[PDB]
Amino acid sequence: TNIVTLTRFVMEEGRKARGTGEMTQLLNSLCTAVKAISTAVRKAGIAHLYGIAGSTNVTGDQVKKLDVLSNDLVINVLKSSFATCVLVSEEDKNAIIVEPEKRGKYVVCFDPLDGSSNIDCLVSIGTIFGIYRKNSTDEPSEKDALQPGRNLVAAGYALYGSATMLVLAMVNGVNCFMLDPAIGEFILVDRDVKIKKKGSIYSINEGYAKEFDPAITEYIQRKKFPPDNSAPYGARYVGSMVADVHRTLVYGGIFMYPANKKSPKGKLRLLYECNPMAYVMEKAGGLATTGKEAVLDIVPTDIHQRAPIILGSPEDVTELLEIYQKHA
Ligand SMILES: O=P(O)(O)OC[C@H]1O[C@](O)(CO)[C@@H](O)[C@@H]1O
Ligand SMILES: O=[P-]([O-])[O-]
Ligand SMILES: [Mg+2]
Ligand SMILES: [Mg+2]
Ligand SMILES: [Mg+2]
Ligand SMILES: [Mg+2]
Numbered sequence: 001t002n003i004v005t006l007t008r009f010v011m012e013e014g015r016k017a018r019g020t021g022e023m024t025q026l027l028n029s030l031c032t033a034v035k036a037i038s039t040a041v042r043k044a045g046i047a048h049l050y051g052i053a054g055s056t057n058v059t060g061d062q063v064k065k066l067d068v069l070s071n072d073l074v075i076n077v078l079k080s081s082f083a084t085c086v087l088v089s090e091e092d093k094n095a096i097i098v099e100p101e102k103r104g105k106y107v108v109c110f111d112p113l114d115g116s117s118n119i120d121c122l123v124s125i126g127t128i129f130g131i132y133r134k135n136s137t138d139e140p141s142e143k144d145a146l147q148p149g150r151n152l153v154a155a156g157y158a159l160y161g162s163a164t165m166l167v168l169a170m171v172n173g174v175n176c177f178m179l180d181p182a183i184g185e186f187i188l189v190d191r192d193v194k195i196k197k198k199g200s201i202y203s204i205n206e207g208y209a210k211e212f213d214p215a216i217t218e219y220i221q222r223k224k225f226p227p228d229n230s231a232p233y234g235a236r237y238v239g240s241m242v243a244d245v246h247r248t249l250v251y252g253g254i255f256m257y258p259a260n261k262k263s264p265k266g267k268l269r270l271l272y273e274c275n276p277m278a279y280v281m282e283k284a285g286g287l288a289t290t291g292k293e294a295v296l297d298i299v300p301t302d303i304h305q306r307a308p309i310i311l312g313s314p315e316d317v318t319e320l321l322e323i324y325q326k327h328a
Contacts, residue, residue: 003185003187004187004188005177005185005186005187005188006027006028006031006166006168006177006185006186006187006188007024007027007028007031009175009177009188010023010024010027010028010168011024013170013172016172020105022082022083022104022105022106023083023106023131023153023154025081025082025083025104026078026081026083026084026104026106026108026131027154027168028081029077029078029080029081029083030074030077030078030081030129031166031186032077033070033073033074033076033077033078033127034127034158034164034166034179034186035164035179035184036073037066037069037070037073037074037112037113037127037158037160038158038160038164038179040066040069040070041066041125041160042160044066044119049065049066049069050064050065050066050119050120051064051065051120052064052065053065053067053068057090057091058090058091058092058093058304059090059269059304059306061090061116062116063091064113064116064119066113066119066125067090067091067112067113067116068091070112070113070127071089071090071091071092071112071113073112074089074110074112074127074129075087075089075096078098078108079098079099079102080102081104082102082103082104083104083105083106084098084103084104084105084106084107084108085097085098085103085104085105085106085107085134085140085144086098086107086108086134086140086141086142086144086145087107087108087109087110088107088108088109088110088142088145088271088272088303089109089110089111089112089272090110090111090112090114090269090272090273090304091112093304094142094303095141095142095144095145095303097140097141098140103140105133105134106131106132106133106134106153107131107132107133107134107140107144107145107147108129108130108131108132109129109130109131109132109145109271109272109275109276109303110127110128110129110130110272111127111128111129111269111272111273112127113125113126113127114126114127114128114157114240114241114242114273115238115239115240115241115242115243117239117240118238118239118240118243123238123239123240123243124159124160124161124162124238124240124242124243125160125240125242125243126157126158126159126160126161126240126241126242126243126246127157127158127160127242128156128157128241128242128272128273128276128277129155129156129157129272129276130149130152130154130155130271130272130275130276130279131152131153131154131155132144132145132147132151132152132153133151133153135147135151142303145271145300145303146299146300146301146303147299147300148275148296148297148298148299148300149270149274149275149276149278149279149295149296149297149298150296150297152275152276152279152296153170153171154168154169154170155169155275155276155277155279155280156168156169156174156276156280157242157245157246157276157277157280158242159242159243159246161243161246163178163179164178164179164181165177165178165179165189165246166178166179166186167193167246167249167280169279169280169283169284170283171283173192173193173283173284174192174193174194174249174280174283174284175188175190175191175192175193176188176189176190176193177189190250193249193250193284194284194285195248195249195252195281195284195285195286195312195313195314196251196252196253196313197252197285197313197314197315198252198313198314198315198316199233199248199251199252199253199254199312199313199316200231200233200234200252200253201233201234201235201236201247201248201251201252201253201254202219202220202223202233202234202235202236202253202254202256202316203235203236203237203238203244203247203248203253203254203255203256204216204220204237204255204256204257204258205237205239205257206220206235206237208260211260211261211262211263212258212260212261213258213259213260213261213291213327214327215291215320215323215324215326215327216256216258216260216291216320218323218327219319219320219323222319222323223235233253241255241257241268241273241277245277245280245281245311248281248286248311248312248313249280249281249284249286252312252313252316253312253313253316254310254311254312254313254316254317254320255309255310255311255312256309256310256320257308257309257310258290258291258308258309258310259290259291259308263306265305265306265307265308266290266306266307266308266309267306268306268307268308268309269304269305269306269307270295270298270300270305270306270307271300271303271304271305274288274295274307274309275295275296277309277311278294278295278296278309278311279296281311281312282296285314286311286312286313286314286317287311287312287314287317287318288309288310288311288317289309289310289311289317289320289321290307290308290309290310291308291310291320291321291324292324292328295307295309295311
């Protein structure tokens with residue numbers, strides 16, 4: 001009878017500081033969309049929600065019916081929250097400017113449904129978000145979303161996995177909240193989560209072996225054939241960034257989506273895929289790099305910009321950074 005809900009938690013975060021409850025309104029609103037997406041996902045084949053919508057998005061994806069439903073849910077709850085002024089979605093070419101009467105201080109970048117290739121085979125999928133404070137007096141505009149991820153004030157993801165989890169990172173740390181399906185509340189289950197300094201799993205799509213740079217190639221060989229006779233790492237690659245990153249957080253190790261000979265900036269999208277996960281990782285004591293610079297320090301010039309990303313346990317990410325340095 002005294003459960004610790006995400007709302008209560010975020011409210012106390014506010015109690016620790018002072019002023020505005022807009023962040024609590026924002027996150028409460030996003031939680032409502034996450035529950036609606038979870039319920040849809042959990043019955044998607046009955047509801048005939050698998051399959052394509054009818055267009056191609058901004059960064060070349062085939063749009064799925066759950067992309068459209070989840071995007072509409074997230075956009076509508078954030079508008080109604082009175083906490084936001086500019087929205088960037090994977091699914092929309094341009095930033096969305098919130099109408100004057102509903103604007104609040106925050107800028108939200110999100111991927112309303114991530115892990116598209118895994119929808120139809122019932123593998124874990126998720127929602128990713130990052131939240132900035134508007135940094136100016138001028139009329140809110142797309143340029144307000146063009147901040148480096150170091151300026152995030154909150155970020156995280158919803159994982160629609162064997163259970164539904166909301167992982168929320170803010171200035172003082174990372175906390176995990178599980179959706180209780182019976183009462184429709186996210187309940188704190190893991191407090192001040194920290195990643196292991198070194199793990200034993202590496203996560204990458206090795207079907208790109210022919211295109212990898214020499215540093216990634218040498219690192220994967222070292223995971224399979226360690227020069228000190230330690231046990232090889234195990235491999236995992238779910239193929240949904242939210243699921244592979246959440247495993248990396250809770251078990252340690254490393255996740256990689258690097259640059260390659262065909263993709264100089266990788267595949268994943270900086271604003272709403274890479275920066276949120278880099279922020280969660282740094283607040284959990286991990287690292288997130290392109291191989292040459294910190295993801296959170298990149299100043300974007302395009303809301304749909306791509307970036308290479310290597311994240312996870314600090315000793316694992318540092319080992320790969322050393323190999324990039326040695327090759328450089
Ligand atoms: O099939 P690939 O190229 O390994 O891409 C998988 C990546 O694509 C995404 O679905 C993004 O498009 C991520 O969730 C995942 O990490
Ligand atoms: O969010 P999508 O690129 O799987
Ligand atoms: Mg997509
Ligand atoms: Mg999309
Ligand atoms: Mg998506
Ligand atoms: Mg995506």
